């Protein structure tokens, strides 16, 4: 039939794509990076412990000044932290307590918040009335909202397998990104804010162009769902954490995998992934209550941050690169260094 | 507090007021019962919610107790990616229709509907997030049951069943079949109830079961249990 002919043609085209990908591979990153000086061992002490949340913390985002923090917890609260003096600047109550993501505007003016309510609320921190009020509620997703990132433009991902670029001034989706066959779990925004990447439970990560709304590339290789994703600081590499206890480093230019970071002693999935300021270290929060810190340019492990009493839910490194925040289901954030 | 500026002291005072407000809010939110309502298609949840867009929250008040009912029927997604958000609920209200003998799935007519609900019950009772949350098992539409059983033998669903084809004897068999799926017999307790469409004691049964769960939890965290 016509359908069968199209399916076999697509299979042949995928075979051609695979052959093209494997024809450009000469040496793994671990063979070119075999003569460099190893990092060794990295020790980080808990400089700050941020307490005040009365439930599991699911979201956390760093401000662009590397001082202010925002964190979202299931007790219906969005708290903004000084993170130097441990002071609380704002405490925002949510209409829906089932929050699973939050974002901080790069200008420090707005905060985004979403969850199982299918709605992305946007709050204005700097008003003349002295209170934080809902500037705009964005609706149109039919599945749970998993990630949101500011670009008056915000890009969100949902559990309905579609992403959406919005316009906060109007309130309607200016672009809709489709092509994922499973729930989209994580978003990552390039340092140039022109190409973003979303990973899905399809065990695939897609690279989308914001201006055209067209999927540039698709990366596969995981054997389970993708929970966290990030860019290399120069915006030319991936960092995906999946449920099969492996992290992976995909390359945009080569359209190919470079490194897999895994160890036998780890059997649980990765919940959060982040790099360091220079991209030499790769942090990764795990289900077994701790946060490993891998050497990213090589493949070896470097350190462990095991000062948490529950699953590490969210992770983040400052823009300056001085500190690392880490949230968990035990309701405490910890600033390391 | 000796090297702080005046604005630093004022900021610390503001933070302390924020903590006071957060503590009061969290104390007010810990005195209210949270029940997660599950079920299958056309099981009878519509009658259950009347007799007492993402998540559908429902408020209720009985005696001096407040209840928050979290209907999750309208959210079609991957369940294992958001079900742990409901870890810590007081109880799981699972509604099953007893009229699922001659009824079959529209997508697959060859598959029975009762087994389809048993699969969901097994998946949610044996889940790794609800190893200590009690289940209130409601069995709805017992008026259609007592008239369907006389013309359609129950043996169609259960080839291994052997007993009298009456209501009072088949109800016990179906209750035992549903209750046997619990592999944690010591941490979880199932409170089965047989209800009709026009019964007004469902909310009292829910109140009794949740008071029992509260008593057991208080005995557990005090060390006596």
């Amino acid at each position: 039939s016509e359908l069968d002919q199209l399916r076999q043609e697509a299979e042949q085209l995928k075979n051609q794509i695979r052959d093209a990908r494997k024809a450009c591979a000469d040496a793994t990153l671990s063979q070119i990076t075999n003569n460099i000086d190893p990092v060794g061992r990295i020790q980080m002490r808990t400089r700050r412990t941020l307490r005040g949340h009365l439930a599991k913390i699911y979201a956390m985002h760093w401000g662009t000044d590397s001082r202010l923090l925002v964190s979202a917890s299931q007790d219906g609260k969005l708290i903004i932290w000084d993170s130097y003096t441990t002071n609380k600047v704002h405490a925002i109550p949510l209409r829906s307590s089932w929050v699973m993501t939050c974002a901080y505007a790069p200008s420090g003016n707005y905060v985004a918040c979403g969850g199982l309510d299918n709605i992305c609320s946007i709050y204005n921190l700097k008003t003349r009335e002295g209170n934080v009020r809902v500037s705009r509620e964005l609706a149109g997703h039919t599945g749970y909202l998993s990630c949101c990132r500011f670009l008056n433009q915000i890009v969100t991902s949902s559990g309905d397998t579609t992403c959406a670029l919005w316009d906060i001034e109007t309130g309607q989706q200016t672009t809709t990104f489709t092509g994922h066959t499973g729930d989209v779990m994580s978003l990552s925004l390039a340092p140039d804010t022109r190409l973003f990447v979303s990973g899905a439970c399809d065990a695939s990560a897609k690279l989308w162009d914001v201006r055209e709304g067209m999927c540039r590339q698709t990366f596969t290789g995981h054997e389970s769902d993708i929970n966290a994703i990030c860019f290399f600081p120069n915006g030319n590499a991936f960092a995906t954490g999946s449920d099969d206890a492996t992290c992976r480093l995909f390359d945009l230019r080569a359209d190919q995998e470079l490194m897999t970071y895994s160890h036998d002693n780890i059997i649980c999935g990765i919940t959060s992934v982040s790099f360091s300021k220079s991209g030499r270290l790769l942090l990764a929060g795990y289900d077994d209550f701790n946060c490993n810190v891998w050497d990213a340019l090589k493949a070896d492990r470097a350190g462990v941050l095991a000062g948490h009493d529950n699953r590490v839910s969210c992770l983040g490194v400052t823009d300056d690169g001085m500190a690392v925040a880490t949230g968990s289901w035990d309701s405490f954030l910890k600033i390391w260094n | 507090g000796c090297t702080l500026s005046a604005e630093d002291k004022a900021a610390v005072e503001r933070s302390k007021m924020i903590d006071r407000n957060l503590r009061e809010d969290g104390e007010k939110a810990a005195r209210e019962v949270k029940l997660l309502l599950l079920g299958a298609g056309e099981s009878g949840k519509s009658t259950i919610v009347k007799q007492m867009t993402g998540i559908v929250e429902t408020h209720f008040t009985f005696k001096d107790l407040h209840f928050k009912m979290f209907d999750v029927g309208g959210q079609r997604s991957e369940r294992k990616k958001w079900i742990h958000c409901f870890e810590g609920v007081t109880a799981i209200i699972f509604c099953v229709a007893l009229s699922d003998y001659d009824l079959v799935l529209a997508e697959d007519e060859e598959m029975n509907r009762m087994h389809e609900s048993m699969k969901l019950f097994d998946s949610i009772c044996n889940n790794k997030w609800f190893t200590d949350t009690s289940i209130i098992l409601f069995l709805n539409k017992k008026d259609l049951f007592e008239e369907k059983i006389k013309k359609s033998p129950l043996t169609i669903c259960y080839p291994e069943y052997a007993g009298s084809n009456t209501y009072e004897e088949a109800a016990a068999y179906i209750q035992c079949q549903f209750e046997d799926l619990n592999k944690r017999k010591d941490t979880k307790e199932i409170y089965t109830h047989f209800t009709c469409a026009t019964d007004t004691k469902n909310v009292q049964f829910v109140f009794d079961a949740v008071t029992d769960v509260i008593i057991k939890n208080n005995l557990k965290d005090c060390g006596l249990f």
Partner: single-chain antibody
Amino acid sequence: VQLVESGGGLVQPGGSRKLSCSASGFAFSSFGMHWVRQAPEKGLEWVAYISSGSGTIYYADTVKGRFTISRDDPKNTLFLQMTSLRSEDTAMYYCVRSIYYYGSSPFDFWGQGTTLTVSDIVMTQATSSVPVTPGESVSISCRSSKSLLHSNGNTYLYWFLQRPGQSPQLLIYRMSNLASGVPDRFSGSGSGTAFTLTISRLEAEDVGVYYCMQHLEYPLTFGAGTKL
């Protein structure tokens, strides 16, 4: 946002009075409040301060024991009860809202004034008048007794502006940050104990008196000010 004041008028010496400020248009329960007067000598003088949750009250050393400041949140009011009004208490009392967290402007909005006629770091400011025709840049200088730069990096200097027939308004907070709605023509700079305010293009809306104030510690002291 609005603060409307009442309770003034002529009072015989030795008596007592009460000044009431009503807030309309903002979350009054989360704002600390100040009472700041101004004698006919054109010198602003901080009088009293009450915290956001009424958990902290400060007074100027001159008025302690005679002035009581108290806020009421449900009806959004601020009261100053004045007892034994001496002849040096003739002024025009202003009420100022103030908010303190990381990155805020603690003196943005001022009240409108209540006439009342009865029958420490020192701030030395440059001069009393700077006659400059519009079109050219104007520089004003201000000096303190000791350094205002704290160990945390902040220098607590505030530059205000009072137009003829109006209440003051915030121009610059912490010596370098420009207030909201203030054009970028004004800018502030300096270091240690010496501070300057420069206006690149003076226009007809910059005429008035300028004041430099410190917020390093209480009491808060205002500069004499320079007329433009």
